[PDB]
Write an enzyme that holds these catalytic residues in place. Structure first.
Site, mmCIF file in Angstrom:
data_model
loop_
_atom_site.group_PDB
_atom_site.id
_atom_site.type_symbol
_atom_site.label_atom_id
_atom_site.label_comp_id
_atom_site.label_asym_id
_atom_site.label_seq_id
_atom_site.Cartn_x
_atom_site.Cartn_y
_atom_site.Cartn_z
ATOM 1 N N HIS A 72 0.816 -1.231 0.000
ATOM 2 C CA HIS A 72 0.000 0.000 0.000
ATOM 3 C C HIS A 72 0.822 1.240 0.000
ATOM 4 O O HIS A 72 0.731 2.060 0.903
ATOM 5 C CB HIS A 72 -1.060 -0.020 1.122
ATOM 6 N N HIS A 116 -7.224 6.754 -3.204
ATOM 7 C CA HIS A 116 -7.966 5.685 -2.491
ATOM 8 C C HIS A 116 -7.291 4.928 -1.341
ATOM 9 O O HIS A 116 -7.957 4.257 -0.525
ATOM 10 C CB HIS A 116 -8.550 4.723 -3.501
ATOM 11 N N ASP A 117 -5.965 4.980 -1.296
ATOM 12 C CA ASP A 117 -5.221 4.331 -0.252
ATOM 13 C C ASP A 117 -4.227 5.258 0.489
ATOM 14 O O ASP A 117 -3.391 4.785 1.238
ATOM 15 C CB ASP A 117 -4.497 3.111 -0.850
ATOM 16 N N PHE A 173 -8.346 -16.837 -3.477
ATOM 17 C CA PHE A 173 -8.640 -15.402 -3.690
ATOM 18 C C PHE A 173 -9.258 -15.091 -5.070
ATOM 19 O O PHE A 173 -10.187 -14.283 -5.191
ATOM 20 C CB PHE A 173 -7.357 -14.598 -3.450
HETATM 21 C C1 LIG Z 1 -6.776 -10.650 4.684
HETATM 22 C C2 LIG Z 1 -6.398 -9.419 5.471
HETATM 23 C C3 LIG Z 1 -4.966 -9.633 5.881
HETATM 24 C C4 LIG Z 1 -7.227 -9.381 6.737
HETATM 25 N N1 LIG Z 1 -6.475 -8.166 4.705
HETATM 26 C C5 LIG Z 1 -7.614 -7.527 4.225
HETATM 27 O O1 LIG Z 1 -8.775 -7.877 4.436
HETATM 28 C C6 LIG Z 1 -7.298 -6.316 3.362
HETATM 29 C C7 LIG Z 1 -6.868 -6.713 1.981
HETATM 30 C C8 LIG Z 1 -5.885 -6.001 1.333
HETATM 31 C C9 LIG Z 1 -5.474 -6.365 0.063
HETATM 32 C C10 LIG Z 1 -6.011 -7.444 -0.602
HETATM 33 N N2 LIG Z 1 -5.551 -7.779 -1.902
HETATM 34 C C11 LIG Z 1 -4.978 -9.036 -2.204
HETATM 35 N N3 LIG Z 1 -5.261 -10.072 -1.407
HETATM 36 C C12 LIG Z 1 -4.741 -11.271 -1.681
HETATM 37 C C13 LIG Z 1 -5.130 -12.371 -0.776
HETATM 38 C C14 LIG Z 1 -6.238 -12.276 0.058
HETATM 39 C C15 LIG Z 1 -6.597 -13.296 0.921
HETATM 40 C C16 LIG Z 1 -5.863 -14.461 1.006
HETATM 41 C C17 LIG Z 1 -4.761 -14.573 0.192
HETATM 42 C C18 LIG Z 1 -4.412 -13.552 -0.678
HETATM 43 N N4 LIG Z 1 -3.924 -11.517 -2.713
HETATM 44 C C19 LIG Z 1 -3.629 -10.485 -3.512
HETATM 45 C C20 LIG Z 1 -4.145 -9.231 -3.290
HETATM 46 S S1 LIG Z 1 -3.709 -7.926 -4.412
HETATM 47 O O2 LIG Z 1 -4.485 -8.133 -5.615
HETATM 48 O O3 LIG Z 1 -3.677 -6.696 -3.673
HETATM 49 C C21 LIG Z 1 -2.086 -8.398 -4.905
HETATM 50 C C22 LIG Z 1 -2.205 -9.754 -5.569
HETATM 51 C C23 LIG Z 1 -2.711 -10.839 -4.641
HETATM 52 C C24 LIG Z 1 -7.006 -8.153 0.046
HETATM 53 C C25 LIG Z 1 -7.424 -7.795 1.313
HETATM 54 CA CA LIG Z 2 -7.869 0.101 0.443
HETATM 55 ZN ZN LIG Z 3 -6.015 -0.255 -3.078
#
Ligand SMILES: CC(C)(C)NC(=O)Cc1ccc(Nc2nc(-c3ccccc3)nc3c2S(=O)(=O)CCC3)cc1
Ligand SMILES: [Ca+2]
Ligand SMILES: [Zn+2]
Length: 345
Positions: free
Chosen positions: A81, A121-122, A293
């Protein structure tokens, strides 16, 4: 340059920026040739390409002054981020705006809002989830009552910074424009809160079922409600577009977000938090969690988007499926996805 470009790679940057209007722009190279000012450099490119500076009488100086300020409120130490992600979401939103199905749909003000929303946005993301901030009783959580905590913060900071010296890029807008843009921006950033994904997708699903196009095949949106719904899903797609870029890029993104997630797990340990330890880098399965995911979040969203813009997003959708297949091939405490799903409740 005022941007941070050495006379050395001014040709390198211009060549990389030739794909400004493409999905396969490489935003990492842009940050290398801009001295880690990708957000400002790409936003400037985008505003020039679209002639937004002149349309809204944002002088260059004001725009650069605001962008540079905005970009310094991102944290370079946070692995995912940071200003590169924001750069990428903006560049990505810029492309989605120009797909033929959305050919001439949006007003310049709507384009200004979407792309601005993408850039802010972030901002000032501390590198931890909303729920972390909630569980630690962060001042932010208290301030927004544990609801869309960070998303609210991004919006706050992004507007606040308009007030700094020569930073008001919206000053030559009419009152009506400013109020319309604002409402749209607020609405798009809150739409990046993940706990809203499913309800977001449930409405995009509906939109598609009764979509109309013109004889030119330009999607037909006749009231604010429809346009803002498309706009907010566009931004959320952009926000969730990593897996749709080239495998080389996608893996860099995943690497970065996993570092950030693990770095969150260290804070949870350090601060002795809620006995429910997330898996560490030895015990997690990152590949499996990706495919989890993509099946649960990314693909269902992109598949519905592609429907809306048929056939504009097909090369996007095929690249998504190739990448899902690559992570798939690499598959062998509370896991990443377990922790993700549980914290949606
Ligand atoms: C899961 C926790 C750690 C609680 N975080 C959140 O809820 C916030 C959050 C922030 C970013 C993501 N964005 C992303 N999340 C994941 C991912 C989520 C759950 C389990 C395994 C992987 N992979 C990716 C992304 S991304 O596309 O940004 C980069 C490529 C892969 C999802 C969720
Ligand atoms: Ca966000
Ligand atoms: Zn974002």
């Amino acid at each position: 340059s005022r941007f941070g470009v050495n006379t050395e790679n001014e040709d390198h940057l211009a060549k990389e920026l030739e794909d400004l209007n493409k999905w396969g722009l490489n935003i990492f190279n842009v940050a290398g040739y801009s001295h880690n000012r990708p957000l400002t450099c790409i936003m400037y490119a985008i505003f020039q390409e679209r002639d937004l500076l002149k349309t809204f009488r944002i002088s260059s100086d004001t725009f650069i002054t605001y962008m540079m300020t905005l970009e310094d409120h991102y944290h370079s130490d946070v692995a995912y981020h940071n200003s590169l992600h924001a750069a990428d979401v903006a560049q990505s939103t810029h492309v989605l705006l120009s797909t033929p199905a959305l050919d001439a749909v949006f007003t310049d003000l709507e384009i200004l809002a979407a792309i601005f929303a993408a850039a802010i946005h972030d901002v000032d993301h501390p590198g931890v989830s909303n729920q972390f901030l909630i569980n630690t009783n962060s001042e932010l959580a208290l301030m927004y009552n544990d609801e869309s905590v960070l998303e609210n913060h991004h919006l706050a900071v992004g507007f606040k910074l308009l007030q700094e010296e020569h930073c008001d890029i919206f000053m030559n807008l009419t009152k009506k424009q400013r109020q319309t843009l604002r409402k749209m921006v607020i609405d798009m950033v809150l739409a990046t809160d993940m706990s809203k994904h499913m309800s977001l997708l449930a409405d995009l699903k509906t939109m598609v079922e009764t979509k109309k196009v013109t004889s030119s095949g330009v999607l037909l949106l006749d009231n604010y409600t429809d346009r803002i719904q498309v706009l907010r899903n566009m931004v959320h797609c952009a926000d969730l577009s990593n897996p749709t870029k080239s495998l080389e890029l996608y893996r860099q993104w995943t690497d970065r977000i996993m570092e950030e997630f693990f770095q969150q797990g260290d804070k949870e340990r350090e601060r002795g938090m809620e006995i429910s330890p997330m898996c560490d880098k030895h015990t997690a399965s990152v590949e499996k969690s990706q495919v989890g995911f993509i099946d649960y979040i990314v693909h269902p969203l992109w598949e519905t988007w592609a429907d809306l813009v048929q056939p504009d997003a097909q090369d996007i959708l095929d690249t998504l499926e190739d990448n899902r297949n690559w992570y798939q091939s690499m598959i062998p405490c509370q896991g990443l996805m377990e922790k993700f799903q549980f914290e949606l409740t």
